[PDB]
Design a protein around this nucleic acid. Structure first.
Lengths: 98, 217, 88, 83, 149, 65, 25
RNA sequence: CGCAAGACGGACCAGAGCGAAAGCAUUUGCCAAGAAUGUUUUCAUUAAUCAAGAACGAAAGUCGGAGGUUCGAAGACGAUCAGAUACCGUCGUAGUUCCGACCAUAAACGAUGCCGACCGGCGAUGCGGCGGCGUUAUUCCCAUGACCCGCCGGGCAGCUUCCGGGAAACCAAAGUCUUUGGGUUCCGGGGGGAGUAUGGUUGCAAAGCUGAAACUUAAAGGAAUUGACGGAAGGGCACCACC
């Protein structure tokens, strides 16, 4: 039986979308279908923002962040626990989780 | 209410509406409430037609008076605001109040303790008080409703267009309806500004109850 | 270019943006506008100036998207190329 | 609403609706007494012109064509004439 | 719904109820016909005539002002074209496309749009042969088409 | 729970009423658009209705996303 | 037996019938 | 730090757009094309759907050139394994790319023919048009952009409702069907045998289109419910669990 209205993916009036490669695996996945997750992330977490800022030649030097748009294979994503299975009620929730 | 002078809208009544805020709708509009409206504002808020409000108020009160035994009218509020207002309305009119939590099966399950079998419902909000509106549809119950401009008119037989959101507006609207059912019954006369004060029906936030507990001395 | 004696005499070879900044600027729900200009200075130095632009979500803009039309993009791109030529 | 006066649409409702879907079919165009201040003669221009209506005995060019209603050149006034 | 598109457009021109002429229009039916002749002599179609008239000369419908319509005013005197303007314009478009497609065999979309236009022609040709405003001997051939400007 | 009185702060105190009601405003704030509707009733002109300069720049909706 | 492989088997079986039929020609 | 070649067009990129479908994403120019809106323009039934016939038709595959960066059917190894002609790894020919010619098939899917009418509500978005306080730019007014608040048409959608339907899942269409008739094309008739044999036909080939029978069989199947089960996800308990 038809599980999703939007057949997993997000194309409505296309017919074809360019595929991307899942990052964990490397499997050809349609762009709209893929679980895209954008990650801004400090080059050092907490243990080193203490130590590196102390040895900062500078005075009041902000650190850079690392900007990587991850794509994911549906298997890629669920094994990596990015997306969980939800109840047939809670499948219809599209709001990104708090 | 209609083509008549004795039941026509008076001047202190308009001041009581305009002061309460019963002319302020929501930002939204129910398709079924487009007749009980004048115009929008800037800030998007819809203005209710207080004449049409009064026409529905008297129609409602007419329906309430037509019930012979008063003790089978159910006066329902669940939301905080109307809880006090309906509890006073039933004191004034000899009706039966349901203030706060409405037990599903009151109108339906004949073995429950709260098995009241009324002849007419009055409802502070169709949205908040949706369960009794649905249970009115299992034991033939006409419903009166205090409907905001975005209140769903499912199972509502007379929609009184108001600002059922604001605490002043609700207390006022119940007082107006309580004073009109008594005037039509013939318990008050229409020449005397009624002894009972519309402040008696107002919900009081527990910041304003603890404002009274201090400021007596 | 030249080495005199304990002095490496250097000359401008090309400005670049930090990946940190360049990535930070590329946000979803707005139009990116790139241009590039093959140009020559008054002295015979030849440059390729790459511009980037991003449409601004307005002060009172309630609509989520902040996208140009394509004619709006290409008129902006035409002014980018016009200005980079004009000021090199 | 169940009951609508389908024969008597209030003019707020009729002018709202699509021209074809009005109870009786009625256009959203009109003829303009367009006069330029340089010349003497009042030319009759169609609102949705879609040509360059010129001043006969050239003092100017009056309107310029767009998607819908033409742009009347800055300086020109217009009365909408009716029957 | 369109013939050779999925388009369900409703961009129609909507004539007013009152077929009765307006008041302001001072041009008599004869001077309108005289101006129609002047436009036809310049080298305009009944479509182009009607536009130029309603824009610059405030004449909504020639049929409303006069009795008759613009082709029938052209046709009575013999200013009307030999083959209709609309079937002219499709043959004109088909010669334009076919010229583009002489040196663009890769352009498969063009080739498909050509077949759609060819079908519009054959379809109108067949209509006008029922009304004998074209000869029964006539048939649009794409090799004979470039002479028909 | 359910006791005899109900319960001297719900029966007795709930008959609390101030000196004059909050609906007894000497100057009622009012927009020109509800003035426009009262003008199309019998109540064209009251004395205790101070009509404000109308609110400018329609900007009330919550931005999306 | 996946339906694609049943087809592939039956397709290669048909290819070995245009071998035993190709001898009498 | 350069050089060369060939692929590919990240992020922007959306339940966004365009296209008959397949499909389509650097810049700029040329070329014809196109829907939608606008229209008091014109022709005046020219139309809807369609045996025959026809155009386009992913990927793989075939033939003759050009090129060969990456990736990689076959193959050579290296592991895992009981075996492992597989999953994993290193190489790697055809191929992947371009040109000309085939081939005509995909879960070519919305598994939903096309045209038309009618029957709910809601806020969004894309295109055009029309109207309306205000802010901003070309500042020097305009008028145009950018927001803002509405309306109209056309489109991709979404949410919601005891419209109604349906075996249900679900569908504003899959509704307006025993209250059964708006037009029309294709096409199904229990499961297998079988998309097989055979004949024709198209193709260089691989194959495609049309396509049975004997025989075999009491079921195969659809949706949903409950349970058990999982080498799925989360929560909880226990010194017959751990610390």
């Amino acid at each position: 039986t038809k599980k999703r209205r939007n057949n997993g993916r997000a194309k409505k009036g296309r017919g074809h979308v360019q595929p991307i490669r899942c990052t964990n695996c490397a499997c050809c996945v349609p762009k709209d279908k893929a679980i895209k997750k954008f990650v801004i992330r400090n080059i050092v977490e907490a243990a080193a923002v203490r130590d590196i800022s102390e040895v900062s030649v500078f005075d009041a030097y902000v650190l850079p962040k690392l900007y990587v748009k991850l794509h994911y294979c549906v298997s890629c994503a669920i094994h990596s626990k990015v997306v969980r299975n939800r109840s047939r009620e809670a499948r219809k929730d599209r709001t990104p989780p708090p | 209410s209609g083509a008549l002078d004795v039941l026509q809208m008076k001047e202190e009544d308009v001041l009581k509406f305009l002061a309460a805020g019963t002319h302020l709708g929501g930002t939204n509009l129910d398709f079924q409430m487009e007749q009980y409206i004048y115009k929008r504002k800037s800030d998007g808020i819809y203005i209710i037609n207080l004449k049409r409000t009064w026409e529905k108020l008297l129609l409602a009160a007419r329906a309430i008076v037509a019930i012979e035994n008063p003790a089978d009218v159910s006066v329902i509020s669940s939301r905080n605001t109307g809880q006090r207002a309906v509890l006073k309305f039933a004191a004034a009119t000899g009706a039966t109040p349901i203030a706060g939590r409405f037990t599903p099966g009151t109108f339906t399950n004949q073995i429950q303790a709260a098995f009241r079998e009324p002849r007419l419902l009055v409802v502070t909000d169709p949205q908040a008080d949706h369960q009794p509106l649905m249970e009115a549809s299992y034991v033939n119950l006409p419903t009166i409703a205090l409907c905001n401009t975005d209140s769903p008119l499912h199972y509502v037989d007379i929609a009184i267009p108001c600002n059922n959101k604001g605490a002043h507006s609700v207390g006022l609207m119940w007082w107006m309806l309580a004073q009109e059912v008594l005037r039509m019954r013939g318990t008050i006369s229409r020449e005397h500004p009624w002894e009972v004060m519309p402040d008696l029906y107002f919900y009081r936030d527990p910041e304003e109850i603890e404002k009274e507990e201090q400021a007596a001395a | 270019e030249d080495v005199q004696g304990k002095n490496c005499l250097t000359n401008f070879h090309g400005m670049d943006l930090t990946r940190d900044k360049m990535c930070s600027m590329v946000k979803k729900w707005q139009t990116m506008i790139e241009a590039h200009v093959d140009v020559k200075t008054t002295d015979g130095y030849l440059l390729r100036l790459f511009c980037v632009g991003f449409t601004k979500k307005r002060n009172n803009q309630i609509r989520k998207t902040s996208y140009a039309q394509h004619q709006q993009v290409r008129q902006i791109r035409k002014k980018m190329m016009e200005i980079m030529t004009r000021e090199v | 609403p169940l009951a609508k006066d389908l024969l008597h649409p209030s003019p707020e409702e009729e002018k709202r609706k699509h021209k074809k879907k009005r109870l009786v079919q009625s256009p959203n165009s009109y003829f303009m007494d367009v006069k330029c201040p340089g010349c003497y003669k009042i030319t009759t221009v169609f609102s949705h012109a879609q040509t360059v209506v010129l001043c006969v005995g050239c003092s100017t060019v009056l309107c310029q064509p767009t998607g819908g209603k033409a742009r009347l050149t800055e300086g020109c006034s217009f009365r909408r004439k009716q029957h | 719904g369109r013939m050779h598109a999925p388009g369900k457009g409703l961009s129609q021109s909507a004539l007013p109820y009152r077929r009765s002429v307006p008041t302001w229009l001072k041009l008599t039916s004869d001077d309108v016909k005289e101006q129609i002749y002047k436009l036809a002599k310049k080298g305009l179609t009944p479509s182009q005539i009607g536009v130029i008239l309603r824009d610059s000369h405030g004449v909504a419908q020639v049929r409303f002002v006069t009795g008759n319509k613009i082709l029938r005013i052209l046709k009575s005197k013999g200013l009307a074209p030999d083959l209709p303007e609309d079937l002219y314009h499709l043959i004109k478009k088909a010669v334009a496309v076919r010229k583009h497609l002489e040196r663009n065999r890769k352009d498969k979309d063009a080739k498909f749009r050509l077949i759609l236009i060819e079908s519009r022609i054959h379809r109108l040709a067949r209509y006008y042969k029922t009304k004998r405003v074209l000869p029964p001997n006539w048939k649009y051939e794409s090799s004979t088409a470039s002479a028909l400007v | 729970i359910s006791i005899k009185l109900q319960e001297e702060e719900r029966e007795r105190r709930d008959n609390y009423v101030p000196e004059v009601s909050a609906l007894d405003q000497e100057i009622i704030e009012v927009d020109p658009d509800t003035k426009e509707m009262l003008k199309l009733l019998d109540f064209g002109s009251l004395s205790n209705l101070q009509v404000t300069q109308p609110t400018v720049g329609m900007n009330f909706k919550t931005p999306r996303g | 037996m996946r339906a694609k492989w049943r087809k592939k088997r039956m397709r290669r079986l048909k290819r070995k019938r245009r071998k035993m039929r190709q001898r009498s020609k």
